[PDB]
């Protein structure tokens, strides 16, 4: 399809193309060089920010990474089928915009506790 | 029944953005042709076989009047103008007393033969040179006597840097490209009126190569419409907003300067020299533009029909000339072949249309044209915030250009109560509106590839 | 040996030194600062490009990473021993230059299908 | 039998590259010694104990005439020259009528005593100052009378910016360093003729600290050869290509200006002052250079033998002087102690060698030297695309330098049929060739660490 | 606590907060733009350097990563409890400053040998 | 018993650093108020609700005299000064003969009425204009006759660029922020004397918004102390080091120019115009500053007590005036309301304190003030390495400012043996010390998140 070609598609179909959008996230006299240079390092900063956020969740180097954080029903009481069959990514972004930071913190504390207790258990053995 | 948080990378969502873009000139523009004002070598080569990806089942909200790309383009054009005017010779020593007289042939009544003392290569002797200067560029000294003593117009406001002898004003397409992590959304809706929803929006990497044509009251060499005339305004009931009429059939306008003029180099100082007009070979004819009467009748009739659709209960709609002010706003100002033209538009916008006449089909053919007179300046001061004007170089031979008017920068008059009449006059406000005639479909969107989705998959311990 | 010291060596010996070449891939008035700045962000862009290409293959954080893509005999009918014993990396680059993009796509679709069906199977459990 | 694709990172392969490099000056150059033209503080410190890694069992193809490092070095030198000439005082008010007369002692016949009116610190009174100016820097006014009125040479082409009073022209080594992801390949083959294969090539991070010596017809303070004389040309059968002869034994050349000269400050305007020559203390002797006759005989004999090897069936080979043109190309132009020297080379390249004489061994010792006369300019205009010349500062005391000629910029004459004779004259073309005498072994290579290799290892599910 | 809030704390307590310090490691006319641009790409270079050093040890994408390198008693003869209970990170940095490079090389050769013999053993199967 | 190497990321350790910082102006400073010297639009907005994180159980060693932030701030202020003085009109044509006479009222004895010929908008006629110039800005021509011919002071050293007509000198807080991977340590120890250990140190992202106040011999609008007077010196037994006394109770100083002065525009050339003083309306009173006698007695008594504590066995301590030199160092130089003031401080530092008098409590109230006379210059040349001075714009109406002295830049006299006497005079050395009065607690630290720790956890095969 191409870049952003599944934006209007459903969730399940848009999950099938994810690498072509991850491609664009990096891509790649005295004033215009400054402007191009600034916007390139800006895009590099966003890519490093997203990669760091992925790394802090234990999902580095992966596109779809599962997490042992339970899904709170207060975030969304909708069951799986209407999320994954007749819904787009934008509408889900709109509904779960208010709970993004809480989900992010739950992921980071889950990954950090997993690392800490893995260290604690593996030192016993 | 249990569910878990799942992370997705490469998610196709976006929000609004105000990121800085970077230019991209065409690859054919790099075939030498150096030292043009809009030719920027810092622009990257245009991407071959560019892609536009149609996004189905999605609707996006656009707004031309809140776009940041127009402001970025205006600032970029201003600083490019500054960079092009920076290096070459300034005419500060040319601010001297000019002994001006009539130009020998009938009287031209547009140029004056002015003699002045200019320093030679040594700054201790001065030679009495002469040149032909337009009357719009020379202000008479004092103002109460016929002493035939004049001076340049901006000898008391700022400095003049004469345009370098090789420079050219030919516009080239400029493809504004968005960085990584950002995309450009283009509204393919052919009916689209400049703002609101758009049900057919496609994602692109770069724009369509917008030509930076500088013009007032008219849109030259612009993209045409697709279905019908599209009237665009931020707020129609507000009279301060400028209506940008978008035509669907561009009208050919042919402009010319039939006079043949000679160029002579004059030394104004040590290491400083500029080119000036010397003589007029042949007869003297006033420069003018020709627009077909029937095609303009078609355009005015269609524009009046659309303005009747947008303004109900108004019995009469009058197209009159501009109100008043300086010559740069009262006349159609453009550049043909390196020469700046200021053309009177009183013959174009002069009509009264009422709803009670059918006005036929404006048929019965004809080759009659509208000869609108034009004047030529050389001391050009556009985008006055820069603080530096120009002395445009003289051009030998005639100049003849053929362009297309593809839009009108109309402007409604002030509040004259509910008298069932509104008079629309040509505008000529800020130049940003001109770029807004081209960036009416492009918006910049900021990609978020990180997404959260519940799935019954649990990560192992 | 050092940087590029096994360029003329065989494949098996050049596989034994790989970290000293991965070191150099990052390393680290108004005009010369611009030039140094531009070439530094250029090198950073190449390093991020190669790291992203490694991440899309499921080989992030590793120097030698195996992949379940079968080796097509049309790419090279040579068996393993003459590849790994009397051959250099440059000559292999010359022979397999025409099939680089196809191999890259096969790796990316293999990794993407592995992630997708891992998600499909782990959601069943 | 089954095989799988395996990914390798850090793979030692490379291709061609045209990436931008960055300079690196030596750490000892940062011991103050500021305000030199080639002293760039933006250059990073030179890497201590630098490594050169020998790559065995590999052969690489080099080409000096298609290298981009030479062009980058030329552009960098040009913009450094512009930046060094930018800040200090311009001599635009010095473009005035000069009353010039003979210099009192015998007549010097190389300088003239010129008096001129210069404005004081207030621009309403002018004082009659005087200075000694070289005859190569003053063009007589008009040209049909002995009025003793002269002017500066470039008072009608461009502007002059006099060199700042502290500035120095001493070259320092510059280590061109390549970025991350790129390397520099150096060809250690001692016989290497500038292009083609090289079986001993090593990878390096930075170059050997190339001194940016500006010279014509000769190579001063350059790297020597190792085995024999190496003749380098893009295409020998083409007469337009410049042969870069690379000597293996550098010849000492001692140049001097025995005249003792006085420096006096002259005020040309408010806040503008420049240093000028005032008087000559002692006797008048012409500046000249000395080259040992026997060593030059050795060099010319070896060069003729190599040119006989490269040009078979030619009975006679003549070394004659330059054809003609301006003084900057017809003479050996260099800079000794901050003073620009232009030395006649007719006494050096004057010989005819035939294949039928053994020419002995050019033995029988001797202390005889070749006294080639030299002239001195102050209005220096090299790399004319910059548009800005120099007024070199006067130097008190004598100046004496001792350099090494390590190469010749020979140039074959035009097509004179197959008459079994070719006359080689000294060149003096573009300065890029000089940098090509140093970057004859360095190429820039682009590292690909990603590699594909089949192995019977299968990744688990 | 916040950034650097456990600098004066003990080793065990400072190991419990590590993500808030890893946050700050990325963070994110003609002269000041140059200065901000240069210092941003400098910080990006340090972050990429530390991430590359983590990747060469087989610890990419992790905050606390164990390693099979034995702890040499010559580096520190102190047993575990006084390291982890009444000691700060700074004092440990001061004591083990002399042996940092040797430890780094031991980690890199351990990871490289692990990759090499994993390749050797998995090719047998 | 077995142990293994464990890697930790995010480790809270740091070392010393010399990284480049970036400025951050306040968000309220972006409410237009453009074209101020210290208003930098390139500064990022100040971070809302900024955090300071207290680090317990840790001690850090600080040194104000080896800090690099002071040098960075000085360089940044210098280049901001250059950028603000770059664009507008230079007064190079103003370097002309001035016919100066006394100013009509009593004689002012501080200004002179100078008439001069200035070129009009055409550079061929000159009009005789006049202006009032301070006697500190005009040097008499020659120096041996009463010809009433003067000139500007720096017509023979450098160029003058007159301050642009809109520019303002109001300081705004500047928050120096450190990049990612680096932090700023602030010493919260209230007793802290500028160097040595600090047991209460907190980490911060940005500084406290230091106002860049330019002053000599005194500290205006600075941060106060907390407990007592803090005397800071790099080496007290060295007499070359400048003591930076830090007061805990700032003293109000009110400065004024009661004269009402008129502003008139004068055309000095084509496109060049500057504002100059024209007339004095009303009576003539000398500009002066008022400092409360009792508060200054309190400050001097406390300073003498602290200096007695730091200098034992010295019976007498004398506070005398400055030794000598130019007016910029001998007087308290500051800027009030866009006007530069140079105030004599002989009345302030004039006392002798001995250890054998109690000196009471300096009680018995009183409204008596110290009227220190002041002079005003317009040709301002501070930080002389820039090479460009200023012509400060004239200000109509009176000017009245009220500031706080929060510190003294004391300086001990030279070695006068062990005579039990040391005379402390006001200083006025390099301006960097002023910034060192504010960056006495901030240091830049470089974060190492990589840590090594032994743990009995072994990674699996
Ligand atoms: C809206 O769009 C229209 C349609 O494109 C446009 O009209 C055209 O404008 C261009 C640009 O001004 C006109 O082209 C000029 O025409 C003449 C001669 O060119 C003719 O002959 C050549 C040779 O085959 C053809 O390629 C060409 O099509 C024409 O038939 C000249 O005035 C111009 O050439 C000079 O200027 C160029 C700068 O762009 C230089 O690159 C070129 O080398 C020439 O400079 C040299 O010659 C000069 C004297 O000849 C000398 O003074 C210079 O120093 C230098 O030596 C240019 O090619 C074209 O004819 C117009 N077309 C029509 C049908 O009229 C409108 O201008 C545009 N409107 C706006 C407002 O932008
Ligand atoms: C090819 O390579 C050769 C070999 O290196 C080179 O010849 C040498 O050139 C240098 C550079 O011009 C010559 O050095 C100059 O020599 C004199 C005096 O220096 C002598 O004494 C000092 C003191 O011990 C010794 O260190 C030195 O070796 C010499 O014996 C001066 O003319 C020069 O010094 C001034 O210029 C320097 C700029 O580089 C300044 O750094 C230095 O401070 C001096 O400036 C000050 O003094 C000036 C008056 O003295 C005054 O005018 C200035 O304003 C300022 O106050 C410089 O050291 C060296 O002697 C040459 N060697 C020989 C054997 O002749 C060739 O030049 C080179 N060729 C090309 C084409 O590049
Ligand atoms: C140490 O700190 C002290 C305490 O802050 C400081 O004293 C104060 O200095 C400021 C800055 O000079 C003084 O403010 C000036 O005051 C007058 C008039 O302002 C009064 O009225 C307004 C209106 O309500 C009040 O907001 C204000 O507080 C005052 O009561 C003017 O001289 C100044 O205004 C002009 O300058 C501003 C530049 O910052 C412009 O933004 C402003 O628009 C004004 O310019 C316009 O007007 C001018 C004529 O009026 C005209 O010439 C201009 O072209 C333009 O049109 C400014 O507000 C304040 O009064 C001082 N406070 C006291 C108690 O004396 C010290 O200066 C400081 N010391 C040092 C060394 O830094
Ligand atoms: C929604 O917008 C998209 C994107 O603009 C439209 O698709 C484009 O349709 C045009 C014709 O309307 C295509 O151009 C021409 O099409 C045919 C072949 O399809 C042929 O005559 C020409 O070769 C030319 O390509 C165009 O290719 C196509 N795609 C793009 C990317 O521009 C689409 O029609 C719109 N749908 C509506 C208005 O219902
Ligand atoms: C849009 O939705 C329709 C069903 O309404 C579906 O058939 C079609 O595939 C969708 N388009 C995309 C691009 O997903
Ligand atoms: C080059 O090849 C020879 C065998 O021909 C081998 O002994 C030698 O080790 C090789 N050199 C390198 C650097 O691999």
DSSP character string of F238-306: -SSSPEEEEEEEEEEEEEEE--EEEEEEEEEETTEEEEEEEEEES-----EEEEEHHHHHHHHHHHHHH
Q: How far is CA F375 from CA A13, F139, F339, F409, in A?
A: 80, 16, 10, 21
Nearest residue to F251 via CA among F410, F408, F440, F432: F408
Q: Furthest-apart CA pair in chain F: how many Å? A: 100
Contacts of F158 in chain D (CB under 8 A): 271
The secondary element (H helix, E strand) that includes residue C38 is helix C32-56
Query: D399-412 and B288-292: which strand pairing?
Result: unpaired
Tell how many helices (H) and how many strands (E) occur in chain C.
Answer: 6, 1
Give the dihedral sign, CA D106/D107/D111/D114.
positive
> Can you tell me whether residue D277 is helix, strand or coil?
strand
Resolution (A): 3.3
Q: Which one, of B336, B332, B374, B322, lies nearest residue B134 by Cα?
A: B374
Question: Which of C3, C4, C7, C9 for mutating ligand 6's site (highest number of atoms within 8 Å of CB)?
Answer: C9
Distance CA F459, CA F461 (A): 7
- C25 DSSP 8-state letter: T
Contact A44 E44 (CB under 8 A): yes
Task: Point out the ligand nearest to the CA of residue D172.
Answer: 2
Please, which residues have CB within 8 angstroms of residue B125's CB and are 6 or more apart in sequence? Answer: B119, D97
Spatial separation of the C-alpha atoms in residues A76 and A107, rounded to whole Å = 17
* Beta-carbon-side half-sphere exposure of residue E86 (alpha carbons within 13 Å): 4
Is position B425 within any domain? yes
d(CA B410, CA F45): 40
Residues 180-209 of chain F whose Cβ lies under 8 A from any Cβ of chain E:
180-183, 203
Tell me the DSSP string of D140-153.
ESSSSS---EEEET
Helix (H) or strand (E) holding B451: strand B451-455
**CB nearest to B156's CB, from F124, F125, F271:** F271
Q: Is the Cα torsion angle D122, D126, D129, D135 positive or negative in sign?
A: positive
CA distance F256 to F254: 7
- By CB atoms closer than 10 A (0-12, 13-18, 19+), residue E6 is buried
Q: How far is the CA of B299 from the centre of ligand 1 (A)?
A: 28
Q: Output the six-digit token pair for F45.
A: 């907005």
Q: Which helix (H) or strand (E) covers residue A123, if one does?
A: helix A100-124
Residue D407, SS3?
Answer: strand
Task: Please name the residues in contact with D122: beta carbons below 8 A apart, sequence gap of 6 or more.
Answer: D270, F95, F96, F97, F141, F151, F155
* Chain B CB contacts of F123 below 8 Å: 92-93, 95-96
Backbone phi and psi for residue C118, each to the nearest 5 degrees, phi listed first: -70, -45
Contact by Cβ (8 Å): F249, F230 = no
Tell whether the torsion through CA atoms of B317, B320, B326 and B327 is positive or negative: positive
CA–CA distances in Å: residue D225 to residues B388, D228, D236, D438: 57, 7, 20, 11
Backbone angles phi, psi at F165, to 5 degrees: -65, -20
Pocket test for ligand 4, best of B55, B189, B200 (most atoms within 8 A of CB): B200
Q: How many helices (H) and strands (E) does chain E have?
A: 6, 1
Query: How many angstroms separate the CA of residue E75 from the nearest CA in chain D?
Result: 29
From A49, A45, A44, A50, select the one nearest A62 (Cα to Cα): A50
Sign of the dihedral through C-alpha A73, A74, A77, A78: negative
Strand ranges in chain C using DSSP code E only, listed in sequence order: 64-70
Inter-chain touch D4–C70, beta carbons under 8 Å: yes
3-state secondary structure A4-66: CCCCCCCHHHHCCCCHHHHHHCCCCCCCHHHHHHHHHHHHHHHHHHHHHHHHHCCCCCCCEEE
Longest dimension (CA), chain D: 100
Interface residues of chain E, partner chain D, Cβ below 8 Å: 119, 122-123
Angstrom distance (rounded) from CA D146 to CA D142: 10
The two structure tokens encoding residue C35: 């030039």
The answer to whether residues F155 and D270 touch, using CB atoms and an 8 Å cutoff, is yes
C-alpha to C-alpha distances, D388 to B333, D81, D91, D163, D216, nearest whole angstrom? 37, 10, 11, 11, 20
How many angstroms separate the CA of residue E91 from the nearest CA in chain F? 9
Q: Which of B341, B242, B248, B356 is nearest to B295 (CA)?
A: B248
Cβ neighbors of D210 (< 8 A, separation 6 or more) are D73, D173, D174, D175, D176, D435, D438, D439
User: What is the spatial distance between Cα D257 and Cα D394, in angstroms, rounded to a whole number?
Assistant: 12
Atom of ligand 5 nearest to the CA of B55: 13
Interface contact D456-E123, CB threshold 8 A: yes
At a CB cut-off of 8 Å and minimum separation 6, what does B423 contact? B317, B318, B319, B320, B412, B413, B416
Residue B67 in domain = yes
Establish if B128 belongs to a structural domain: no
Q: What CA–CA distance (Å, rounded) separates D19 from C35? A: 11
**For chain C, domain boundaries:** 11-124
The contacts of residue A73 (CB under 8 Å, 6+ apart) are: none
Closest CA–CA distance from residue F455 to any residue of chain A (Å): 7
Interface residue of E12, E22, E24 to substitute, partner F, most F CBs within 10 Å: E24
Quick check: C91 and C97 in contact, CB under 8 A?
no
Among the listed residues B337, B346, B357, the one whose alpha carbon sits nearest the alpha carbon of residue B319? B346
Query: In the numeric block, which tokens belong to residue F332?
Result: 């308290």
Chains A and D lie in contact, requiring 3 or more CB pairs less than 8 Å apart: no
CB-CB neighbours of D40 under 10 Å: 20
* Chain gaps in chain D, named by the residue before each (C–N > 2.5 Å): 105
Residue in the structure block whose two tokens are 């008190």: D396
Read off the tokens for F348: 């302030």
Q: Do chains C and B touch (3 or more CB pairs under 8 A)?
A: yes
> Are the C-beta atoms of residues D10 and C22 closer than 8 Å to each other?
yes
| Residue linked to tokens 């940062």 | D30
Q: Which of C3, C4, C5, C8 to mutate to test the pocket of ligand 6 (most atoms within 8 A of CB)?
A: C8
Cα separations in angstroms, D186 against B403, D55, D191, D210, D249: 58, 10, 14, 14, 22
Residue of A30, A48, A58 with shortest CB distance to E61? A58
- Whose tokens are 């050096």? That residue is D348
Beta strands in D303-439 (DSSP E): 316-319, 332-336, 339-343, 351-354, 369-377, 379-380, 388-391, 399-412, 421-426
Any residues with Cβ below 6 Å from ligand 2, and which? D 33, 168, 170-171, 213, 220-221, 334-337, 400-403
Give the nearest partner residue to C55 out of A28, A40, A61, using CB atoms: A61
Which residue in B426, B334, B319 sits closest to B380, CA to CA?
B334
| Among D62, D341, D308, D372, residue whose Cα is nearest residue D186 | D62
Asked if F166 contacts F145 with a C-beta cutoff of 8 angstroms, the reply is no
Question: D293: domain range?
Answer: 4-87+168-448
Which of F151, F154, F159 is closest, CB to CB, to D122? F151
From the list B168, B137, B377, B129, the residue with the least C-alpha distance to B273 is: B129
Q: Which of C67, C106, C112 to mutate to test the interface with A (most CBs of A within 10 A)?
A: C112
**What does each C-alpha distance from D120 to B286, D271, F63, F140, F179 come to in angstroms?**
52, 9, 51, 15, 52
Are F234 and F63 in contact, with CB atoms under 8 Å apart?
no
Residue F120 inside a domain? The answer is no
Report the separation in Å between the CA atom of B187 and the middle of ligand 4, taken as the mean of its atom positions: 13
Q: Are B343 and B253 in contact (CB under 8 A)?
A: no
Give yes or no for a contact between A35 and B20, defined as CB atoms under 8 angstroms apart.
Answer: yes
Closest ligand to C-alpha of residue F255 is: 3
Residue D323 lies in a domain: yes
Q: Is residue D139 part of a domain?
A: no
The Cα A18–Cα A25 span in angstroms is 11
Q: How many residues does chain A have?
A: 125
- Domain CATH number, residue D59: 2.170.40.20
Q: Which tokens sit at F288?
A: 């002066």
Residues 6+ apart with CB under 8 A from F209: F26, F46, F173, F174, F175
Our CA dihedral for A34, A35, A38, A44, rounded to 10 degrees, sits at -130
The reply to whether B199 falls in a domain is yes
The values of phi and psi at residue F424, to 5°, are -100, 120
- Name beta bridge partners: D126: D119
Q: How many domains does one find in chain B?
A: 1
C interface test, pick of D1, D2, D3, D5 with most C CB neighbours within 10 Å: D5
The most distant pair of C-alpha atoms in chain C lies apart, rounded to whole Å, by: 63
CB-based contact B235:B241 (threshold 8 Å): yes
- C-alpha E5/C-alpha E14 separation (Å) is 8
- Method used to solve the structure: cryo-EM
Q: What is the DSSP letter of D43?
A: S
Pairing of strands D388-391, D159-162: parallel
Give the residue among B305, B362, B374, B299 at the shortest CA–CA distance from B336.
B374
- Given a contact cutoff of 8 angstroms between Cβ atoms, the answer to whether C54 and A54 are in contact is no
**Ligand 1 atom at minimum distance from B400 CA:** 65
Q: Which of D211, D214, D185 is nearest to D200 (CA)?
A: D185
Which residues have a Cβ under 8 Å from the Cβ of F27 and sit 6 or more positions away?
F45, F46, F48
Q: Alpha-carbon distance D256 to E122, whole Å?
A: 76
Whole-Å CA distances, F221 to F171, F376, F381: 10, 21, 23
Burial of A94 (0-12, 13-18, 19+ CB in 10 A): exposed
Which residue spans within D191-322 are E strands per DSSP? 195-198, 201-204, 218-220, 230-232, 243-257, 260-269, 272-281, 288-292, 316-319
User: What tokens does C11 get?
Assistant: 């494949």
Backbone φ and ψ for B140, nearest 5 degrees, come out as -65, 140
Chain-centre distance for alpha carbon C92: 13
């Amino acid at each position: 399809l191409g870049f952003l070609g599944a934006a209007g598609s459903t969730m399940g179909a848009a999950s099938n193309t994810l690498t072509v959008q991850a491609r664009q996230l990096l891509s790649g006299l005295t004033v215009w060089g400054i402007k191009q240079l600034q916007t390139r390092v800006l895009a590099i900063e966003r890519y490093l920010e997203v990669q760091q956020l992925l790394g802090l969740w234990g999902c580095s180097g992966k596109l779809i990474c599962c997490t042992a954080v339970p899904w709170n029903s207060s975030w969304s009481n909708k069951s799986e089928t209407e999320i994954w069959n007749n819904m787009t990514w934008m509408q889900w972004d709109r509904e779960i915009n208010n709970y993004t930071n809480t989900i992010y913190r739950l992921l980071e504390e889950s990954q950090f506790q997993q690392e800490i207790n893995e260290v604690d258990l593996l030192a016993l053995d | 029944g249990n569910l878990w948080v799942t992370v997705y990378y490469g998610v196709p969502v976006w929000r609004e953005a105000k990121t800085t873009l970077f230019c991209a000139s065409d690859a054919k523009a790099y075939d030498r042709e150096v030292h043009n004002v809009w030719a920027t070598h810092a622009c990257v080569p245009t991407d071959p076989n560019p892609q536009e990806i149609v996004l189905e089942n999605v609707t996006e909200n656009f707004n031309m009047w809140k776009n940041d790309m127009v402001d970025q383009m205006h600032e970029d054009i201003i600083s490019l103008w500054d960079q092009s005017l920076k290096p070459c010779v300034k005419l500060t020593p040319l601010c001297v007393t000019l002994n001006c007289t009539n130009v020998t042939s009938v009287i031209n009544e547009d140029m004056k033969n002015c003699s002045f003392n200019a320093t030679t290569e040594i700054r201790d002797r001065k030679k009495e040179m002469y040149a032909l200067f337009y009357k719009l560029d020379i202000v008479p000294l004092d103002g109460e006597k016929s002493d035939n003593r004049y001076r340049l117009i901006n000898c008391n406001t700022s400095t003049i840097t004469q345009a370098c002898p090789k420079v050219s004003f030919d516009p080239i397409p400029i493809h504004y490209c968005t960085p990584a992590g950002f995309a450009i959304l283009k509204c393919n809706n052919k009916t689209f009126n400049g703002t609101g929803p758009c049900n057919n929006v496609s994602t692109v990497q770069c724009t369509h190569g917008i030509k930076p044509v500088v013009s007032t009251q008219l849109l030259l060499n612009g993209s045409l419409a697709e279905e019908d005339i599209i009237i665009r305004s931020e707020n129609l009931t507000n009279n301060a907003k400028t209506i940008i009429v978008h035509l669907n059939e561009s009208v050919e306008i042919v402009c010319t300067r039939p006079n043949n003029m000679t160029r002579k180099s004059i030394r104004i100082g040590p290491g400083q020299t500029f080119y000036a007009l010397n003589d007029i070979i042949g007869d003297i004819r006033q420069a003018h533009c020709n627009i077909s009467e029937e095609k303009w009748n078609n355009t005015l009739h269609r524009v009046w029909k659309k303005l009747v659709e947008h303004f109900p209960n108004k019995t009469t709609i009058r197209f009159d000339r501009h109100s008043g002010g300086d010559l740069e706003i009262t006349t159609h100002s453009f550049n043909c072949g390196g020469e700046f033209f200021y053309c009177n538009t009183s013959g174009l916008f002069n009509i009264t249309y009422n709803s009670n006449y059918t006005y036929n089909d404006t048929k019965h053919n004809g080759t009659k044209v509208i000869t609108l007179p034009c004047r030529i300046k050389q001391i050009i001061n556009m985008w006055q915030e820069v603080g530096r004007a120009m002395y445009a170089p003289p051009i030998a031979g005639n100049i003849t250009c053929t362009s297309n008017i593809t839009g009108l920068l109309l402007t409604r008059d002030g509040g004259n109560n509910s008298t069932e009449t509104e008079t629309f006059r040509p505008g000529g406000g800020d130049m940003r509106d001109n770029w807004r005639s081209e960036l009416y479909k492009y918006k910049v969107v900021e990609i978020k590839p990180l997404g959260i989705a519940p799935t019954g998959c649990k990560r192992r311990v």
